[PDB]
């Protein structure tokens, strides 16, 4: 039973993922009561591109042994990869609807970075470091597609350029955290940045819902100081001063949006 | 049965390819009905230099189980390696017949690059990336030896220098795609470049068959603009503008050669 | 019995430490008389962060087979890691009591370097090279916390700055030996440097116990020439001249402290 | 039987060489008729420093199966390592007898490079590349100790400086081939260089045996042009021109020494 599991692990060490998955399937055929076999089969199938078979293997492993958190780990990993691909295609659709080559190439680079981080987490599934890194990355691309849909609903060139700057800083911070996964400083920087983007999109949505020139100019002012401070903290992540500055800024945006 | 297969895999992980192949042979001796055993034995024997034994193992694996595409994969890999060695010796023979030290050292560097890519695909057989990369490389060296035979059949110094420039850009693009295998931009660049070289050799062959000064000068003009645009796209691969430019150029060469 | 040991080793090769530890536990469940199983389980559990389970596994392996020195090796490794964490928290407490941001960030960087060396020795336990490297590092942080407690007991700004310089050169030499573990030159440099720091802390403690202005100025003079020569030998480790110079200096400090 | 062999291989993959050797010994205890077990045990024991146990394991593997050339391979590897250590201690003794710090540090660097190449071939035993590389290196250190003994027998400062230059270029070429093992150009360069050193030591020995001022000046002239051309070919290894130049020079030295 476990002999073919060892064989599949060995084949996976030699980068022969396909033969590894075949040996895992054969081991499961010998004894389908092996949760580790289904677990490894899903893990290796994730690397091939057959996300559906990997999800089925994860479901089988979870149903066979619920206490196995590692099975739940790659289950959430597959969910996150599907979520990231959905956000990527949504960003592509929004960029195509806008027609701007700038936002189109930015969405393309964002998709490329998401795929790179997905390949990284596929190579190292158990590492909570890159797990949470890609979690921040996927909320980043989600905030990005929310900003894109808000910009499309608005239609003004000013807020269009504002959303362009926001998604630019977003993908820049995402590239930073992808290059440096195990650095808590850029981790906190990314968390603060995505919180700032969430506050910014909420504020601009509320301003567009109101529809007054004064509140629109106020919204442009807060998002402009927000992109300023976000670029500042992205260039200087290890500064608790600028961290508290962004925290104060997002607190002020929240106070303003709940006041209006 | 599978115990010695595991032993051979382990030995192959330790870079002990010879003992790995011996353990694979012993595993096949224990049970010759193991397609995976023959498959791994051929894969590891490819790395030793015994292409004949690897081809025999591939044939045995295919005849035992035809559905195994990975066996067909290294079968085509061995075919491609033999094809590349044949093109390499043909290029060496043509360069020696021409006597030019320039074309001789270019053929030598081309053989070196082909051997490097062959070693790479031997180390990573299952990767369709480097598989198709070496496929483009082998059609590149085939177009190169076709250009060499055409230049030898012509004998003019002008077309000799033209073929020199073509094989120079060919080996440069081949080195580029060998250094960067997983980049679709240089993949498309190499495909476009080899299409351009095919059109160029066809056009110059037709011009030499005609044998008129005006059509010869026209051929020299198209191949000169072709090497210009090929160097341009090789220096700027990520430019869809120059990609479409080369596409238009090869379309014009095809139209001209079918018109004459 | 050994099948699950092989399975755990294979899983550990794939960076699946958790499943590796689970397979090791299952192998021990199959036969608890396997000293190698307990040994590997402790080794892999050290990497997870469960130092207690790793220490228990080391104790089990030692009690099952005392002749196994490798078990004693990671036993001492766990003891050293606990010792280093204790020295790290003591340095943090001393830096917080002093309130100086300089000494606080120095203690933070020292903790970071200690954790990095601990992760390195966890990845490569059997290497006596990094073993003894982290041994010198832990006596370095111990001399550092001794200097911190001496500076806190003194309270003078002069000796405070002196201790700051000593811990600065200490953490610099520790970073050097962590970056270059397999270099006997920096090994001897670190040994000489920690001997110099031990002599310096002993001398300054004796001077503070005496409490005379002349012996205090003499102590400041010896520690100043000591930090001078220590920086010199840290910048030029491969100089037997400066090595003998530091040896003469520490001999003079010992003679003076035993004379007073 | 083979289960413990797999266990030892796995442990060796994790850099646990000691436990790997222990598992190999246990596998041999289970069945001493395993030539592969003795082979792997010797291979791994070579890495520990117990050259005697590795040599005994090699002898056992050869006596059990003579057809195993890989056993003969690490047998010759151990012989070469012992030969290199003997040449290293002979060079150290000669440098100490001469008392020159220059030749002493050169012999020290030569010993360091020999040990580095020995560790490399221990890590990769089956690679004929580094095998033959260290073969050229060991004939290089042998020619070096021959030059040292010749310089000691002569005693003149001129020939002392000449031998210093020869051993300098020798260790430089040896460092080059150690840094670049898989480069046939530096392989041929090293072969030509060691042939030149052999001719030079033979010529200077014959000149010292004759003992005439004119033949001594002639010998100094040939060794000076030899070190000139050797430095030239070491700086430009890929030049067949300088290769043929050194070949002509060594041919002239041979003609002269057989004429006198």
Residue numbers in the entry:
A (entry chain C), B (entry chain B), C (entry chain D), D (entry chain A): 1 to 260
Sentences copied from the publication:
The second protocol simplifies the process by overlapping the helical termini of the DHRs and HBs and designing only the immediate residues around the junction (HelixFuse, HF). For the second approach, HelixFuse (HF), the same set of DHRs and HBs were combinatorially fused together by overlapping the terminal helix residues in both directions (“AB”: c-terminus of HB to n-terminus of DHR, “BA”: n-terminus of HB to c-terminus of DHR). Sixteen tpr1C4_pm3 fusions were tested, 14 found to be soluble, and 10 displayed monodispersed peaks by SEC. C4_nat_HF-7900 was found to form monodisperse particles by cryo EM, with the 3D reconstruction modeled to 3.7 Å resolution. Inset shows the correct placement of the rotamers in the designed junction region. d C4_nat_HF-7900; design model (purple/grey) and cryo-EM map (yellow/white), with insert highlighting the the high resolution (~3.8 Å) density. e C5_HF-3921 as characterized by cryo-EM, with inset showing density surrounding the designed junction. f C5_HF-2101, g C5_HF-0019, h C6_HF-0075, and i C6_HF-0080 all showed a good overall match to its negative-stain EM 2D class averages (top) from one direction, using a predicted projection map (bottom). We show that it is possible to genetically fuse DHR “adapters” to natural proteins; these proteins can then be used in larger assemblies through WORMS with less likelihood of disrupting the original protein fold.
We develop a hierarchical approach to designing multi-component protein assemblies from two classes of modular building blocks: designed helical repeat proteins (DHRs) and helical bundle oligomers (HBs). We first rigidly fuse DHRs to HBs to generate a large library of oligomeric building blocks. We then generate assemblies with cyclic, dihedral, and point group symmetries from these building blocks using architecture guided rigid helical fusion with new software named WORMS. X-ray crystallography and cryo-electron microscopy characterization show that the hierarchical design approach can accurately generate a wide range of assemblies, including a 43 nm diameter icosahedral nanocage.
